[PDB]
Design a protein around this ligand. Structure first.
Ligand code: GTP
Ligand code: MG
Lengths: 6, 172, 1037
């Protein structure tokens, strides 16, 4: 999927 | 005589100059006069095994007067990152100061100091200060006004640099 | 020579002197005196010049000292960050080639890499800055090229791993405040789209490479990547198994691999349960091999090296993280129960380490576990709850840990005041107090789970103290702190029995022990324990009376610390059991308050003045519990008799001859009397008015006279006279007078009486005296005092606000108008007073001369321009509240708008675009948002351009656009137009407004030239339009 918010 | 280099960094108006001046002369400064660039101040402590000198490089926490910035960190032996427990933004910027510091100093002793703990209204709660954990930094609550814990960071740095966990200041 | 060198360096019409630059930098890094500062200034000026980089290459072609090379790289990085968008493409390509070639050349040589790592790091950071500027639009094949170069060579692979780590840090960790939202999102998407190749390279290096430094660098890069990469790359590959098997057990990879495992464990998803269970199981299996459960982790840490201590800390972190996250997941598996217990065992072992931070992590986990178990079922030992049944075997171990390592309940500090007074103070919320609070909460939860086990542990500890096996002052103090911490955690009957047993055993121990010091320690511990159980003392009157009489007896004990302990315990008991000193107790003829008051002189004959003040505060707490008005008044009169005698004697002496007020001893006596009065007022509250009413006028007579003296002294020998003891005592008297007035007014429940009686004397005694004083002699507390009064009186003091201003306002403004530094306390208190007046006495502002209101507005603007954070925040709050108040009153709203709206907006924008005022950004945005909403709804019904009756919104758009363009000429018209449209569109979304302001702040620091590609004008406009539509829909709803 897409990256994760930090 | 053994003398190290200490780099004191942190946001503007956190108490770096006040802390250094209180250690140098004992007088508390009530007015905020922003530092321009960096000021080098020699502190001398007396341990049970001789005198130890910290050449503190009190840097400017404001971008406008930042100066060389990372140029000061070169050849630094220890560091103190200071923030203000009455302003959350000062703590929120601790990661940035740490990042700038490590890039020039791969592995040095680092003390994270939270100043102004004497003020009744505390904005950075003691339970929210967790940055030092994953970074192997030594955290200390200090107070330049009230002299609370004001000597612990230097003692920890001296112990780390000399490698003697049983080192103490005698104030001879 | 120095000035000539500086001029030569800054003279860009002549060739740079590399030797001179090297000498200057060597002086900076090894100088002594003004030479180092001069070198700093010269280097900063040289870096500032826009044409410095034209010499940077030359420096890198001729410099010998690494410091000068670092300086040149700093200049180059500044140029890349700022002006990269206006340089010719040929120059950009040349810089790219030079940077890449230098990186490759320096990384190729192992000796050069070893010698200078700061140079390599700076070069990598410059490369990352170039990547941020260009990649991927102008460098679409960077990722593939670096992957191939890494695959070809090992040193190049290590350098590329470092570069990729830096890129990830700058794109995902430190993007906010340095990259706009649109460009940050673009960079994140680009990094995530090409991450497959990077992950494949990392996996290849981990699985195949045998070069330890390269594997370490790859592990560090992976640790950095784990913060953001999609979960699939973690929980659907061999990453966890590879880390646990190939690196976790290796001595030189254990720390970094454990950090990676901790980062993986911190993740919380509901579809990778098997992966988390496998992670836990394999990590536990490895740990049991590399760290036997029979090891003494405390001794290992004590004698361990830095790597060992870091490993122990990381192990504690990993255990705490994974347990707090997936304890329920692990519990559900029966076959893993033993493993779970082993994990707990490890925690307990680490809990024995003499390290504050490691213990804090372990205690955080213990608190979480105890809280969860208590929430499951708060009842004590029906069938035991499932989770409690699982954890029963070690809950007693946790209880023993809590009791054996209890932290000090309170922190006491000796501080020298401004005047030189040595004062004992209690810290409110520090790290150590938080530690004690967490330990107390954990122990209270555990005791609620079952009190028999806690009582048994405490009894065993007390027995071991009695028999001498574990006897020491530290152990007794810790045990007594643990006993006190659990107050109220058990029923009244069990508490009574347990406390009776504990006190009997402690008294026996005190009897058996020999020496004054041991007896003092044991007695102090007994007093602390009894003072922590107010319910016990309330239940039994004989015990309470015996305790109080024992405290009075101790108050005559000259042994160090006994009197302070007695006074602290007495005030604690008086506060907690106040209602039991005023009523008549069975077997008594009169209430204990009368008995104490009759013998007050003989009780405090040996106490020090601060202890006397504490005793008076405790007695005042007791007095304040008397509900009857007449008896309370009689008690108050009998209560202040001793201070009042000295007060009256001093007043009569002064009336006979005012010169007595210059006698230092009289001033010390007055200060002590006023401190006693302040403490009594704090303890008693409103009914103390009578005492104040008895001395008020006389106090105001002592204040003013003393004030005058101080001023005279300053006029005779300057400010240095303020350091003399006599002036310090006079200032102490003045400050105590102000403290008494402020305290009573704050605690007084009668604004009308206060305004009628106590304010008019203040107007002349303090305010006009404050005005007549020289600037050096003015007391800042006055202003603060007034603020308090206003905060309490509001509408009852509005009529007096003008006069008050005429006494303090102008004379104060002229003191804090020449700079932002001098008289910090005066600025703070003045703006607090202005805030109080604005919040509670706005009609005073609405009913003053227009010139005075203009001066007030100018003072507020001066306030929010301050470097001091508190002053600026107060100014911003004042401005926001003033805007709301003006909006509330319709009549003057239009006039205020047409007179000050544009000026306030201009000043707000001036502070907003300043880096020194970012801490107040939130408030800035709020104000701005409100203002723009005010201009968009139509509240301003009068055009702000009388000459041209144009729509308010259009006029404001043009005005702000022109103001920003003039302030920052290098901005593009499209940039300013988009910024203004967002200002007028995001006015109902404060977080979005603040993000927009941050985007503008980062934009104005970069010269975008004529390039509109990096601005993402289309995406930003689409976002603004979506926000406008959402706000419109919310308005319709
Ligand atoms: N309440 C309180 N104020 C303090 C304390 N220490 C310093 N201050 C105040 O906080 C401000 C700090 O000013 P400086 O010492 O110049 O701060 P700095 O961080 O060195 O400033 P820059 O050089 O601009 O980064 C001043 O107002 C100090 O008087 C403290 O322990 N308590
Ligand atoms: Mg400073």
């Amino acid at each position: 999927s897409h990256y994760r918010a930090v | 005589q053994v003398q190290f280099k200490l780099v004191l960094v942190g946001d503007g108006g956190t108490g770096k100059t006040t802390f250094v001046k209180r250690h140098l002369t004992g007088e508390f400064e009530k007015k905020y006069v922003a530092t321009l660039g960096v000021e080098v101040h020699p502190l001398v402590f007396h341990t049970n095994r001789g005198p130890i000198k910290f050449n503190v490089w009190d840097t400017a926490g404001l971008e406008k007067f930042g100066g060389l910035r990372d140029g000061y960190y070169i050849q630094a032996q220890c560091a103190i990152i200071m923030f203000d427990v009455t302003s959350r933004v000062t703590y929120k910027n601790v990661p940035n100061w740490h990042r700038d510091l490590v890039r020039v100093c791969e592995n040095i002793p680092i003390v994270l100091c939270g100043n102004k703990v004497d003020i009744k209204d505390r904005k950075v709660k003691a339970k929210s200060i967790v940055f030092h954990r994953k970074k192997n930094l030594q955290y200390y609550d200090i107070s330049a006004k009230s002299n609370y814990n004001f000597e612990k960071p230097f003692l920890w740095l001296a112990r780390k640099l000399i490698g003697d966990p049983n080192l103490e200041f005698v104030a001879m | 020579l120095a000035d000539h060198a500086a001029r030569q360096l800054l003279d860009f019409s002549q060739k740079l002197d590399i030797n001179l630059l090297d000498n200057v930098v060597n002086c900076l890094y090894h100088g002594e005196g003004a030479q180092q500062r001069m070198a700093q200034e010269v280097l900063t000026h040289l870096k500032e010049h826009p044409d410095a980089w034209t010499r940077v290459d030359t420096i890198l072609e001729f410099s010998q000292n690494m410091n000068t090379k670092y300086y040149g790289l700093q200049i180059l990085e500044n140029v890349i960050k700022t002006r990269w968008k206006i340089l010719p493409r040929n120059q950009c390509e040349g810089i790219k080639k030079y940077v890449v070639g230098l990186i490759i050349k320096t990384s190729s040589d192992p000796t050069c890499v070893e010698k200078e790592k700061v140079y390599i790091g700076k070069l990598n950071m410059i490369l990352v800055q170039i990547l941020k500027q260009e990649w991927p639009k102008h460098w679409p094949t960077f990722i593939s090229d670096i992957v191939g170069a890494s695959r070809t060579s090992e040193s190049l692979c290590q350098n590329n791993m470092v570069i990729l780590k830096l890129l990830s840090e700058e794109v995902f960790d430190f993007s906010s405040g340095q990259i706009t939202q649109v460009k940050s999102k673009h960079l994140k998407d680009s990094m995530c789209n090409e991450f497959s190749q990077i992950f494949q390279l990392c996996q290849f290096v981990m699985e195949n490479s045998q070069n330890a430094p390269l594997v370490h660098a790859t592990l560090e890069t992976l640790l950095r990547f784990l913060n953001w990469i999609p979960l699939g790359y973690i929980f659907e590959t061999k990453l966890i198994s590879t880390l646990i098997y190939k690196f976790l057990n290796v001595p030189m990879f254990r720390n970094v691999s454990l950090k990676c495992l901790t980062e993986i464990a911190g993740v919380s998803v509901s579809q990778y349960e098997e992966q988390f269970v496998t992670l836990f199981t394999l990590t536990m299996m490895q740990l049991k091999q590399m760290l036997p459960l029979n090891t003494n982790i405390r001794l290992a840490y004590s004698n361990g090296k830095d790597d060992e201590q870091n490993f122990i800390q990381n192990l504690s972190l990993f255990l705490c993280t994974f347990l707090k996250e997936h304890d329920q997941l692990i519990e559900k598996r029966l076959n893993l129960r033993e493993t779970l217990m082993e994990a707990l065992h490890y925690m307990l072992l680490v809990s024995e380490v003499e390290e504050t931070e490691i213990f804090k992590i372990c205690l955080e986990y213990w608190n979480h576990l105890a809280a969860e178990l208590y929430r499951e079922s708060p009842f004590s030992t029906f069938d035991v709850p499932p989770r409690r049944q699982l954890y029963l075997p070690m809950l007693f171990k946790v209880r023993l840990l809590m009791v054996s390592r209890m932290a000090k309940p309170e922190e006491v500090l000796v501080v020298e005041n401004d005047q030189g007074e040595v004062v004992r103070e209690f810290m409110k919320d520090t790290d150590s107090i938080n530690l004690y609070k967490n330990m107390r909460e954990t122990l209270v939860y555990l005791t609620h789970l079952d009190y028999v086990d806690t009582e048994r542990i405490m009894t065993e500890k007390l027995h071991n103290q009695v028999n001498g096996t574990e006897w020491s002052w530290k152990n007794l103090n810790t045990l007594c702190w643990a006993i006190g911490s659990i107050s109220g955690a058990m029923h009244e009957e069990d508490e009574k029995r347990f406390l009776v047993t504990v006190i009997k055993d402690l008294l026996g121990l005190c009897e058996q022990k020999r020496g004054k010091d041991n007896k003092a320690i044991i007695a102090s511990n007994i007093m602390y324990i009894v003072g922590q159980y107010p319910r016990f003392l309330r239940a039994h009157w004989k015990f309470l009376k015996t305790v109080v009489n024992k405290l009075f007896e101790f108050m005559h004990e000259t042994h160090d610390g006994v009197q302070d302990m007695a006074c602290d315990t007495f005030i604690k008991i008086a506060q907690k059991c106040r209602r039991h000193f005023v009523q008549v107790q069975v077997g008594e003829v009169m209430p204990f308050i009368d008995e104490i008051l009759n013998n007050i002189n003989t009780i405090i004959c040996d106490l020090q003045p601060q202890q006397v003040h504490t005793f008076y505060e405790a007695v005042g707490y007791m007095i304040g519990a008397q509900t009857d008005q007449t008896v309370q008044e009689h008690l108050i009169e009998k209560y202040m008799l001793l201070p009042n005698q000295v007060w009256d004697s001093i007043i009569q002496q002064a009336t006979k001859n005012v010169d007595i007020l210059k006698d230092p001893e009289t001033v010390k006596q007055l200060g002590s009397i006023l401190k006693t009065n302040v403490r009594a007022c704090k303890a008693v509250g409103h009914p103390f008015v009578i005492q104040l009413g008895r001395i008020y006028l006389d106090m105001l007579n002592v204040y003013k006279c003393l004030s005058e003296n101080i001023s005279a002294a300053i006029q005779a020998n300057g400010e240095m006279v303020t350091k003399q003891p006599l002036i310090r005592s006079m200032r102490t008297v003045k400050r105590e007078t102000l403290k008494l007035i402020s305290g009573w007014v704050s605690r007084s429940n009668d604004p009308q009486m206060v305004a009628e009686n106590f304010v008019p004397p203040l107007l002349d005694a303090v305010l006009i005296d404050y005005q007549r004083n020289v600037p050096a002699a003015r007391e800042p507390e006055v202003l603060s005092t007034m603020a308090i009064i206003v905060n309490k009186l509001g509408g009852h003091i509005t009529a007096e606000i003008p006069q008050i201003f005429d006494a303090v306002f102008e004379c104060t403004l002229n003191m804090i108008n020449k700079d932002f530094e001098e008289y910090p306390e005066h600025r703070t208190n003045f703006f607090l007073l202005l805030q109080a007046v604005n919040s509670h006495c706005f009609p005073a502002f609405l009913a003053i001369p227009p010139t005075q209101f203009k001066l007030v507005l100018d003072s507020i603007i001066w306030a929010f321009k301050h470097t001091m954070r508190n002053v600026a925040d107060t100014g911003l709050q004042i401005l926001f509240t003033l805007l709301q108040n003006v909006a509330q009153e319709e009549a003057a709203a239009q006039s205020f708008y047409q007179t000050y709206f544009c000026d306030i907006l201009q000043h707000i924008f001036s502070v907003v675009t300043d880096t020194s005022h970012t801490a107040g950004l939130t408030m800035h945005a709020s104000i701005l948002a409100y203002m723009f909403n005010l201009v968009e709804e139509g509240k301003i019904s009068t055009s702000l351009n009388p000459g041209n009756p144009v729509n308010n919104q259009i006029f404001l758009q043009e005005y702000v656009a022109n103001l920003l363009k003039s302030a920052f000429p290098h901005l593009q018209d499209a940039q300013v137009k988009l910024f203004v449209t967002g200002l007028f569109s995001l006015n109902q979304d404060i977080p979005a407004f603040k993000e927009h302001l941050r985007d503008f702040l980062v934009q104005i620091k970069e010269f975008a030239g004529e390039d509109t590609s990096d601005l993402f004008l289309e995406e930003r406009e689409i976002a603004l339009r979506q926000a406008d539509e959402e706000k419109h829909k919310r308005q319709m709803s």
